[PDB]
Amino acid sequence: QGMSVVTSFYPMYAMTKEVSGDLNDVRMIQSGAGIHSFEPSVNDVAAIYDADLFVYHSHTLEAWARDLDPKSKVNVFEASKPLTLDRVKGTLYDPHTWTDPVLAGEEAVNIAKELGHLDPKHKDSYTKKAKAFKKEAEQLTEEYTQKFKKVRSKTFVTQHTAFSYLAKRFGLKQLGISGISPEQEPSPRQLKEIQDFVKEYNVKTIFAEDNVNPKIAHAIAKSTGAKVKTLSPLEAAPSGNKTYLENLRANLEVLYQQLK
Ligand SMILES: [Zn+2]
CATH class of the missing domain: 3.40.50.1980 (Nitrogenase molybdenum iron protein domain)
Known part of the structure; x- marks a missing residue:
């Protein structure tokens, strides 16, 4: 039916x-x-x-x-x-x-x-x-x-390039360790450019995601003096039964609390 x-x-x-x-x-x-x-x-x-x-x-x-x-x-x-x-x-x-x-x-x-x-x-x-x-x-x-x-702080670094539109709509700047796809991983050279970005813009949180290994996420964190947290691009079914918007909302809060 x-x-x-x-x-x-x-x-x-x-x-x-x-x-x-x-x-x-x-x-x-x-x-x-x-x-x-x-x-x-x-x-x-x-x-x-x-x-x-x-x-x-x-x-x-x-x-x-x-x-x-x-x-x-x-x-x-x-x-x-x-x-x-x-x-x-x-x-x-x-x-x-x-x-x-x-x-x-x-x-x-x-x-x-x-x-x-x-x-x-x-x-x-x-x-x-x-x-x-x-x-x-x-x-x-x-x-x-x-x-x-x-x-004041308006920049954040995510596992991959998945928050360009969200950052855009809230007047923020985002940088992905990996490209549009989690498969487009950075070379040692680009790893350096990312660490320099984290230091220059003074980012203090590198947002890992469940869908990918945070090993590299943690390495950059150790080297730039930041902590690792989780910011989900909602590409995988979230645990628990929240609404699409409540899940999105949840992450809008971590980002918000972090940049604060
Ligand atoms: Zn993606």
Whole structure:
């Protein structure tokens, strides 16, 4: 009862699920680490072909989604079609929009439309709930755009380049030890450039993430006089049952408390 929905990783599962409510059956492909270097198993693609809707974030992330041509009434929906992804500096694009409350809220809205478009009978519950999500997202944005405006230290160093949009929306500066993907690891040379960055901007916290070994994270910490903490890009299903925004909110707090 209700259409089968399938999502790529955590931010998609959370959004479509909170928007659908109890209506459909939402499932997720990759709930762990590696969405960047992930490739679906034959089983994964099968669940996609037996599902009424399969929502994934982008072609710049789930590259494997582009190569799916069904005989099944399954809809492939690239939820971040509207958004305008920034180019990667240093051409490819930074897919990390979901860590930005606004862009996240407006992508959740886009899913509500696709949900409503396939099931007009309940198009209200979809749009009704998407109003809430988007709403809670503005409230969180206002709350933190305010808290960060009171903070002097504006720079933070994360495991990889995953917080460019979040840093952007709150007037912060972020530097990743690794690139857009956790696989794009730094050479000894770049390790030096990062340590010099931490010293120059006087960063006192290097934010490791669960999805990757903090060995290097800790090394830089020891050498630049900083402590290691955890800042999650929400790419892996968080422990506990919080809302997408409450999880995001949680991290907005550690960042905030740290820069303070
Ligand atoms: Zn990432």
